[PDB]
Design an enzyme around this catalytic site. Structure first.
Site, PDB file in Angstrom:
ATOM      1  N   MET A   1       7.074  -6.431  -5.323  1.00 30.12           N
ATOM      2  CA  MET A   1       7.495  -5.315  -6.129  1.00 30.12           C
ATOM      3  C   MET A   1       6.298  -4.130  -6.184  1.00 30.12           C
ATOM      4  O   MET A   1       5.115  -4.591  -6.188  1.00 30.12           O
ATOM      5  CB  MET A   1       7.830  -5.743  -7.715  1.00 30.12           C
ATOM      6  CG  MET A   1       8.918  -6.602  -7.865  1.00 30.12           C
ATOM      7  SD  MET A   1       9.294  -6.983  -9.590  1.00 30.12           S
ATOM      8  CE  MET A   1      10.673  -7.709  -9.423  1.00 30.12           C
ATOM      9  N   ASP A   2       6.980  -3.051  -5.728  1.00 25.31           N
ATOM     10  CA  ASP A   2       5.846  -1.724  -5.781  1.00 25.31           C
ATOM     11  C   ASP A   2       5.871  -1.167  -7.274  1.00 25.31           C
ATOM     12  O   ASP A   2       6.368  -1.829  -8.139  1.00 25.31           O
ATOM     13  CB  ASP A   2       6.426  -0.642  -4.860  1.00 25.31           C
ATOM     14  CG  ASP A   2       7.942  -0.341  -4.891  1.00 25.31           C
ATOM     15  OD1 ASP A   2       8.287   0.232  -6.082  1.00 25.31           O
ATOM     16  OD2 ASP A   2       8.834  -0.876  -4.112  1.00 25.31           O
ATOM     17  N   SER A   3       5.430  -0.146  -7.508  1.00 22.47           N
ATOM     18  CA  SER A   3       5.282   0.507  -8.788  1.00 22.47           C
ATOM     19  C   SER A   3       6.756   0.713  -9.367  1.00 22.47           C
ATOM     20  O   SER A   3       6.672   0.273 -10.540  1.00 22.47           O
ATOM     21  CB  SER A   3       4.691   1.826  -8.702  1.00 22.47           C
ATOM     22  OG  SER A   3       3.257   2.066  -7.979  1.00 22.47           O
ATOM     23  N   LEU A   4       7.717   1.144  -8.674  1.00 28.92           N
ATOM     24  CA  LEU A   4       8.837   1.457  -9.477  1.00 28.92           C
ATOM     25  C   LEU A   4       9.661   0.396  -9.545  1.00 28.92           C
ATOM     26  O   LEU A   4      10.415   0.123 -10.523  1.00 28.92           O
ATOM     27  CB  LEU A   4       9.499   2.585  -8.541  1.00 28.92           C
ATOM     28  CG  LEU A   4       8.947   3.995  -8.666  1.00 28.92           C
ATOM     29  CD1 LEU A   4       9.672   5.074  -7.921  1.00 28.92           C
ATOM     30  CD2 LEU A   4       8.386   4.396  -9.998  1.00 28.92           C
ATOM     31  N   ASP A   5       9.579  -0.577  -8.504  1.00 36.61           N
ATOM     32  CA  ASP A   5      10.549  -1.839  -8.570  1.00 36.61           C
ATOM     33  C   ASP A   5       9.763  -2.857  -9.652  1.00 36.61           C
ATOM     34  O   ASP A   5      10.658  -3.333 -10.375  1.00 36.61           O
ATOM     35  CB  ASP A   5      10.257  -2.689  -7.307  1.00 36.61           C
ATOM     36  CG  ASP A   5      11.396  -2.050  -6.279  1.00 36.61           C
ATOM     37  OD1 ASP A   5      12.341  -1.479  -6.645  1.00 36.61           O
ATOM     38  OD2 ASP A   5      10.893  -2.312  -5.011  1.00 36.61           O
TER      39      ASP A   5
END
Ligand SMILES: CCCCCCCCCCCCCCCCCC(=O)OC[C@H](COP(=O)([O-])OCC(O)COP(=O)([O-])OC[C@@H](COC(=O)CCCCCCCCCCCCCCCCC)OC(=O)CCCCCCCCCCCCCCCCC)OC(=O)CCCCCCCCCCCCCCCCC
Ligand SMILES: CCCCCCCCCCCCCCCCCC(=O)OC[C@H](COP(=O)(O)OCCN)OC(=O)CCCCCCCCCCCCCCCCC
Ligand SMILES: CCCCCCCCCCCCCCCCCC(=O)OC[C@H](COP(=O)(O)OCCN)OC(=O)CCCCCCCCCCCCCCCCC
Ligand SMILES: CCCCCCCCCCCCCCCCCC(=O)OC[C@H](COP(=O)(O)OCCN)OC(=O)CCCCCCCCCCCCCCCCC
Ligand SMILES: CCCCCCCCCCCC(=O)OC[C@H](COP(=O)(O)OCC[N+](C)(C)C)OC(=O)CCCCCCCCCCC
Ligand SMILES: CCCCCCCCCCCC(=O)OC[C@H](COP(=O)(O)OCC[N+](C)(C)C)OC(=O)CCCCCCCCCCC
Ligand SMILES: CCCCCCCCCCCC(=O)OC[C@H](COP(=O)(O)OCC[N+](C)(C)C)OC(=O)CCCCCCCCCCC
Ligand SMILES: CCCCCCCCCCCC(=O)OC[C@H](COP(=O)(O)OCC[N+](C)(C)C)OC(=O)CCCCCCCCCCC
Ligand SMILES: CCCCCCCCCCCC(=O)OC[C@H](COP(=O)(O)OCC[N+](C)(C)C)OC(=O)CCCCCCCCCCC
Lengths: 149, 183, 78, 80, 71, 95, 105, 353, 161
Positions: free
Chosen positions: F41-45
């Site tokens: 997961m990235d920042s927004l995910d």
């Protein structure tokens, strides 16, 4: 400077009260007077030649229990609740035309049919418990059993 | 007082509908062992006009009938039948006299009462003529017990409360007696 | 006397909003009025059944007591 | 139908609905008192009926005030 | 005291109130005779609440504090 | 009445179900499963998952906790410690 | 002694006399027990409810039913509508069957 | 025909009397709206309605007919209960109150020894009609009016009821017609001038008229509880509010100005002496005079209802609550003790005759 | 045709289906109105007006309290009921409406015989006031004592300070 156009609506409102007063004072007085003439329509409507000037009876207000007794008594004497008669002796029909109102003495319908108001410890006992009725039926049964002696 | 009862006519037919009122008649007369009497035939207005004349003429019979009721100890309706018939005949005699001696004055008075809500204060002119005629022909005087003679309301000269609408027949008859009788 | 004036409005508004629900109540109301007006005796029978099953003195129970007394008194006289 | 406690369904599911039920129940006793007094032609029973109306009105005021303060306490932060 | 006249007046008053509504329901022209925007039950822009032009939060069942509750 | 009725196993079970509705790398999720590495997961995910987890348990992660949470177990611990039932009206409790 | 059974006009009602005689019997010193006052208690309760008299009416109606007697042949005539207490029913000599005026006295 | 018609009219006569009675009240209420606009116009140096019917005599008809030809706005057609339950209760409350208003001696539809109680009780029902409109409503201005409406009721109800009880206590009767006849020698305006002012103030508060027009303040709550009303619901509420104005104006004439009693007894006798009491024409004129006396006194206070609107600004409702409880209630309760003390001192306790 | 039966049946139907608090206070009004009207006819006109004078004022105060407490709970809470079962419940309650089981007392009518001994006739309210202020003046004074307690009681419960 009196503006007469502003006073026109007040004059019509003044006539509005007069319409009610004129109709009520005259029609009600005439109806009472007409029914006091006699027990049949041939006397209430038709005016006799030898009859004198009509004397009107005005509506009655501020009455009590005595006036209710008088109204029924006047009905049995003249056929009208406000009939007029100054005879010293009443007719023979007055002896046996007495009116006695017979009516039931049951509780109000709301007391015995409201979904909430009819529920109480004593009302359930009256409605579903025979303890009161069985004991009171003894008094009714004692009446017949005490006849022969 | 307009309280509904089971003894007389109620206020409206809706009261009768809720009470299931039956207006019951009886077709049987009094038994023959009770002597028959002639009932009074006067309506409400003539009775109120002659109330003080019946009392003056039949005071001893009114008291005797009422004393019979108190001394009967609950058996008043049955025991006091004899005393009741004396009052009925005496009261009828007063009305019969009023129709033979003071018919014009008597009829003027109770027709005023029918015209003025059966209130004594609204027919003083007609009552005064009637009171004078009865006294001069029957020697009966209206009297209100318990108060001094000069403090009777029917003899008051300037009452505070007076009828709103004058009775024209009373006004004409009163003027016919003012000029003629009192020259 | 306020219900006299209110009754036409509530009844009309009852059918306008719930015609089927008002019909069942009105139909039930009229059926028991017809039973009492025509002397069909449906409600009387239910009342007699309730008094009999709950031990209450019933119309027939009161009358049977009179019959027992009448039979007894007649035998005593004769 | 009363012995199965049918009236417990006719009462709503709010605290104020319980208050309404009590007022109706007390009103039924007053109607019964007026019914008996009127038949007997007894003004003593009508005195009792008037007292029951006045007393029941006092009861409603006290109960409402408790319910008013009870609702006030929950919404009583009033930081704004 | 007779109150049959009073009862007739009370009956007329109840009937009179329904006449005003019945007259208004039978006098107004049908929607098709007007701009024909359909029934009011569908014209949600008309049957909606009035908030002086701008729609706001819907607080129909929110509590309303009363400053004169003790009075 | 107004008390938590959560358990560590039930919270973990519902946490896994929410996270399996996303495009995570692995469907094997436990307490030690990291968002950045294991789930990819990235920042927004990650913030989408955190808000989705907020909706399930009716809780709100604070700024400091949300900006420093690493593993699913930390999410489970936060839910257990901070969850409360929403206050009901006066009629729900006393009636 | 507090007042009970007060009529709508401030005086004793129909059943006060029965109640008064009950109180006099119960408070009288000559009596040893309340048995002599038992009959007076029944009269007071009969004055209010008339339960025994209604029971007597129930027997007479039921007895006439088994004998085949028609209720209208042995009963009392009655009128259910006050506006139809006509002068013909009242027996007036010139009595008509037209309805009487009961709207406004 | 003929014979079957001359008794059919007698059978339906009393229904014509009631219909004429209803028309008599409606005409006054209908032209009170026209009179109010005409009266305010000249006070404001305008004209008021003069271009709808000859000199504006059809202004009331046009306003009613146009609104009766207007669409009814409601969420659904079946929701006719919600927007009509309120106005109908308010209209029925004020129309039933007119039953005990005697235009002459005994000329009232309902006569009873408890007419005063029936009058106050019937009026209190009309308050329930106003609060019905705010039935968990989504309109914020409708909701605010309901809160103000309840606050005003707490203000005037205690004050208005007690003032009427003092007049009833002075006559020892709760019958309106008996109260009217008791003022033959003195009109109660003279002994109870403070109460007449208090009664009129309470009447303004009861009808939500300015300076107590907080329920329908256009500059505060656009239209109050009527902001969501249109066509017939608006008319019925509008009719009920103006029917209360006529009723309260008539009540002021009854309690303090002798009701239908003549202004001058001498003039009343002279006019009636021109007519024969053996003919119906006397009683037609008599009803006109007696109601004319009531109309003149009632029209003055209907003028005063308009007069105060055109001369005083609106008072805040919270100030009204303090006004009645701190000032009006102590004064009226003081008088309810003062009056029996005077009557007992001079051996003049009232009785009904 | 006793129309009081139909009105109570309608009132009873809405009692079982009432959901929000506003419908409950409407039930109270739909209960006092049949009581007042049935009192206005038949038994007692005096207390029919007394019920209107006192209870209508209490209704408004009751209504204004509801506006300060409604919290959206019953605007979305579901109810199940069922039209068939509701009618069945009301039908069974309609079967038994005999509050008393004295058949003679309920089926046999009685009359009273009026008398002329009461020449001084006044309303029942005057007789109530005559006894309440003379015979039972203690009850009247204690009632005022209770009213005093309520005034003090309301202030201490409600007032914050
Ligand atoms: C009545 C006495 C008045 C009178 O007889 O003559 C005036 C009045 C007509 O006024 P006007 O003679 O033309 O005025 C004189 C000049 O034109 C114009 O002269 P003016 O306007 O300059 O006169 C001024 C005068 C005002 O003019 C007046 O004198 C009128 C009197 C007003 C006070 C009393 C009301 O003084 C005032 O302005 C102050 C009055 C107001 C003070 C506050 C109120 C005190 C009471 O005559 C009438 O009575 C007839 C009109 C009445 C209405 C009849 C039609 C009614 C509608 C029926 C239905 C259709
Ligand atoms: C047209 C239909 C009308 C129907 C009306 C009734 C509606 C349904 C209600 C069910 C009936 C139960 C109530 C019956 C009346 C109350 C009981 C009673 O008083 O006895 C009546 C019945 C027969 O009485 P019986 O002996 O024949 O005659 C009297 C002679 N002295 O004696 C009986 O045996 C009746 C049955 C009572 C025994 C069973 C109930 C008690 C045991 C279960 C209790 C369950 C609830 C417990 C709640 C306790 C709360 C403290
Ligand atoms: C309205 C529905 C009323 C239904 C009803 O049953 O009314 C019965 C009514 C009573 O009869 P009533 O007119 O009072 O007889 C008096 C005779 N002196 O008599 C009736 O039948 C009333 C029917 C006529 C009333 C309709 C309005 C008449 C005036 C129209 C203008
Ligand atoms: C008086 C004439 C003008 C009023 C006429 C209005 C007729 C409507 C029914 C009147 C009340 C009859 C008895 C019912 C008790 C109250 C129940 C109620 O809440 O009102 C019924 C109304 C119908 O709408 P409905 O959707 O079916 O109910 C909600 C279902 N969740 O649901 C509503 O909530 C709408 C409420 C609107 C405001 C009504 C306020 C009460 C009115 C009482 C005045 C009449 C007194 C009672 C008379 C009949 C007595 C049985
Ligand atoms: C007396 C009088 O004036 O009675 C004549 C009447 C009414 O006159 P008005 O001025 O409209 O009465 C209103 C009275 N005020 C001015 C006090 C409001 O006239 C007609 O239409 C008949
Ligand atoms: C008092 C005032 C009198 C003057 C206005 C009268 C208006 C009513 C006549 C009308 O509406 O007539 C036009 C109508 C139909 O046409 P619509 O417009 O679709 O009707 C809409 C009106 N509904 C709702 C009754 C259908 O014709 C008819 O067959 C009338 C029957
Ligand atoms: C009655 C007394 C009032 C009549 C006024 C009038 O008839 O008013 C005149 C009317 C309305 O037209 P308007 O433009 O408002 O006239 C006002 C003139 N202004 C503007 C200068 C003030 O015109 C007509 O005659 C046309 C219709 C035929 C007669 C219908 C009469 C109304 C029916 C209800 C009353 C019978
Ligand atoms: C404030 C003034 C009230 C007022 O003007 O009314 C008081 C008086 C009159 O009424 P009164 O003298 O109190 O009693 C009634 C007196 N009669 C019998 C003359 C009607 O009115 C006028 O004479 C004007
Ligand atoms: C001769 C007749 C005149 C006597 C005047 C006596 C006044 C005493 C007074 O006002 O007493 C003073 C006290 C306390 O006043 P405070 O505001 O608390 O403090 C005073 C001011 N400070 C803060 C500067 C110190 O007031 C009270 O008790 C208020 C209640 C009075 C009665 C209210 C109801 C009225 C009902 C009337 C009958 C129906």
């Amino acid at each position: 400077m009196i503006p007469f156009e502003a006073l026109i609506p007040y004059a019509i409102m003044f006539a509005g009260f007069c319409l009610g007063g004129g109709v009520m004072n005259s029609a009600i007085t005439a109806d009472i007077t007409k029914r006091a003439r006699g027990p049949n329509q041939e006397i209430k409507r038709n005016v006799g030649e030898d009859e004198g000037p009509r004397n009107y009876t005005k509506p009655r207000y501020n009455t009590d229990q005595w006036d209710k007794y008088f109204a029924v008594r006047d009905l049995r004497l003249t056929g009208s609740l406000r009939g007029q008669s100054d005879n010293a002796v009443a007719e023979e029909s007055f002896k046996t035309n007495s009116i006695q109102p017979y009516s039931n003495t049951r509780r109000p319908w709301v007391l015995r049919r409201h979904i909430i108001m009819k529920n109480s410890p004593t009302k359930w006992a009256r409605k579903y418990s025979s303890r009161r009725d069985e004991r009171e039926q003894e008094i009714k049964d004692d009446y017949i059993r005490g006849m022969g002696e | 007082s307009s309280t509904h009862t089971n003894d007389s006519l109620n206020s409206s037919n809706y009261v009768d509908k809720l009470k299931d009122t039956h207006f019951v008649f009886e077709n049987d007369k009094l038994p023959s062992e009770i002597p028959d009497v002639e009932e009074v035939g006067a309506t409400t207005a003539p009775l109120l006009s002659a109330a003080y004349f019946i009392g003056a003429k039949c005071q001893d019979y009114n008291d005797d009938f009422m004393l019979c009721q108190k001394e009967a100890k609950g058996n008043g309706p049955i025991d006091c039948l004899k005393e009741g018939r004396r009052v009925t005949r005496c009261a009828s005699g007063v009305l019969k006299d009023l129709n033979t001696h003071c018919s014009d004055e008597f009829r003027l008075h109770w027709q005023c009462l029918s015209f003025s809500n059966l209130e004594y204060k609204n027919c003083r002119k007609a009552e005064s003529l009637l009171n004078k005629c009865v006294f001069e022909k029957m020697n009966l005087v209206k009297k209100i017990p318990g108060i001094p003679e000069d403090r009777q309301i029917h003899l008051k000269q300037n009452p505070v409360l007076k009828p709103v609408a004058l009775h024209q027949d009373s006004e004409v008859a009163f003027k016919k007696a003012q000029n003629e009788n009192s020259i | 006397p306020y219900l006299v004036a209110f009754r036409p409005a509530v009844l009309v508004f009852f059918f306008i909003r719930q015609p089927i629900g008002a019909g069942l109540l009105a139909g039930g109301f009229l059926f028991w009025q017809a039973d009492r007006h025509f002397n069909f005796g449906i409600r009387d029978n239910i009342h007699n059944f309730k008094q009999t099953i709950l031990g209450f003195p019933t119309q027939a129970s009161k009358w049977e007591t009179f019959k027992q007394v009448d039979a007894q008194k007649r035998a005593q006289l004769v | 139908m009363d012995l199965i406690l049918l009236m417990l369904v006719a009462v709503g599911l709010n605290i104020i609905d319980i208050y309404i039920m009590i007022e109706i129940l007390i009103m039924g006793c007053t109607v019964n008192t007026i019914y008996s007094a009127s038949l007997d032609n007894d003004m003593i029973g009508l005195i009792y009926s008037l007292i029951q109306i006045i007393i029941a009105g006092v009861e409603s005021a006290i109960g409402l005030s408790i319910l008013v303060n009870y609702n006030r306490i929950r919404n009583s932060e009033e930081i704004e | 005291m007779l109150q049959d006249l009073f009862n007739n007046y009370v009956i007329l008053v109840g009937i009179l109130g329904l006449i005003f509504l019945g007259v208004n329901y039978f006098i107004v022209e049908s929607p098709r005779m007007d701009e024909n925007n359909g029934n009011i039950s569908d014209y949600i822009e008309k049957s909606g609440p009035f908030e002086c032009g701008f729609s706001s939060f819907e607080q129909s069942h929110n509590p309303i504090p009363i400053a004169f509750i003790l009075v | 009445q107004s008390a938590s009725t959560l358990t560590k196993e039930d919270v973990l079970t519902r946490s896994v179900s929410v996270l399996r509705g996303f495009e995570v790398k692995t469907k094997d999720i436990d307490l030690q499963t990291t968002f950045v590495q294991d789930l990819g997961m990235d920042s927004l995910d990650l913030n989408d998952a955190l808000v989705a987890l907020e909706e399930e348990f009716d809780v709100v992660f604070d700024d400091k906790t949300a900006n420093e949470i690493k593993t699913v177990g930390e999410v489970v611990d936060f839910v257990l410690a901070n969850y409360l039932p929403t206050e009901q009206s006066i009629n729900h409790t006393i009636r | 002694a507090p007042l009970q059974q007060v009529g709508r006009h401030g005086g004793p009602n129909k059943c006060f006399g029965e109640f008064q005689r009950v109180v006099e019997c119960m408070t009288n010193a000559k009596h040893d027990s309340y048995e002599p006052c038992n009959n007076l208690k029944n009269d007071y309760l009969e004055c209010r409810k008339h339960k025994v008299e209604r029971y007597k009416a129930f027997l007479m109606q039921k007895h006439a039913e088994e004998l085949g007697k028609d209720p209208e042949e042995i009963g009392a005539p009655f009128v259910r509508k006050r506006r139809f207490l006509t002068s013909k029913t009242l027996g007036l000599v010139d009595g008509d069957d037209y309805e009487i005026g009961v709207e406004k006295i | 025909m003929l014979n079957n018609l001359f008794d059919f009219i007698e059978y339906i006569e009393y229904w014509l009397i009631i219909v004429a009675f209803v028309a008599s009240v409606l005409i006054v209420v209908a032209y009170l709206t026209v009179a109010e606009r005409k009266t305010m116009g000249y006070m404001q140096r305008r004209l008021g309605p003069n271009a709808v019917g000859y000199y504006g005599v059809l202004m009331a008809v046009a306003d009613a007919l146009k609104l009766l030809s207007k669409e009814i706005v409601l969420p659904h057609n079946g929701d006719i209960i919600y927007v009509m339950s309120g106005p109908l209760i308010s209209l029925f409350s004020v129309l039933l109150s007119w039953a005990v208003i005697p235009f002459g001696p005994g000329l009232s539809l309902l006569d009873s020894e408890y007419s005063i109680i029936y009058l106050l009780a019937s009026g209190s029902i009309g308050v329930f009609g106003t609060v019905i409109v705010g039935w968990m409503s989504n309109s914020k201005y409708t909701v605010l009016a309901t809160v103000r409406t309840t606050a005003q009721l707490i203000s005037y109800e205690l004050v208005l009821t007690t003032v009427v009880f003092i007049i009833a206590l002075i006559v020892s009767s709760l019958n309106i017609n008996v109260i009217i006849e008791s003022q033959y020698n003195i009109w109660y305006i003279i002994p109870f001038f403070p109460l007449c002012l208090i009664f009129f103030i309470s009447a303004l508060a009861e009808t939500a008229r300015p300076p107590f027009d907080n329920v329908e303040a256009e500059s505060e709550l656009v239209s109050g509880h009527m902001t969501e009303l249109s066509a017939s619901p608006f008319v019925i509420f509008f009719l009920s509010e103006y029917c209360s104005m006529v009723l309260m104006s008539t009540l002021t004439a009854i309690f303090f100005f002798g009701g239908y009693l003549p202004f001058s007894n001498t003039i009343h006798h002279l006019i009636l002496n021109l007519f024969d009491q053996h003919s119906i024409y006397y009683f037609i004129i008599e009803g006109i005079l007696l109601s004319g006396y009531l109309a003149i006194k009632a029209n003055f206070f209907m003028f005063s209802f308009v007069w105060i609107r055109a001369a005083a600004p609106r008072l805040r409702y919270d100030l009204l609550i303090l006004f009645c409880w701190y000032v009006l209630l102590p004064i009226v309760f003081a008088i309810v003790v003062f009056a029996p003390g005077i009557l007992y001192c001079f051996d003049a306790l009232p009785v009904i005759i | 045709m006793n129309l009081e039966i139909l009105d109570l049946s309608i009132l009873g139907f809405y009692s079982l289906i009432s959901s929000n608090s506003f419908e409950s206070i409407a039930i109270l009004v739909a209960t006092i109105m049949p009581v007042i009207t049935e009192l206005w006819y038949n038994y007692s006109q005096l207390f029919a007006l007394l019920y209107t004078l006192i209870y209508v004022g209490a209704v408004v105060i009751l209504f204004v309290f509801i506006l300060s407490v409604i919290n959206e709970k019953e605007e979305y809470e579901y109810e199940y009921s069922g039209l068939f079962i509701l009618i069945l419940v009301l039908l069974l309650d309609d079967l038994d409406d005999n509050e008393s089981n004295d058949n003679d007392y309920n089926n046999v009518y009685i009359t009273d015989y009026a008398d002329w001994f009461n020449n001084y006739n006044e309303s029942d309210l005057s007789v109530i006031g005559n006894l309440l202020f003379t015979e039972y003046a203690l009850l009247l004074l204690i009632i005022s004592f209770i009213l005093l307690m309520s005034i003090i009681g309301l202030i201490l419960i409600v007032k914050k300070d």
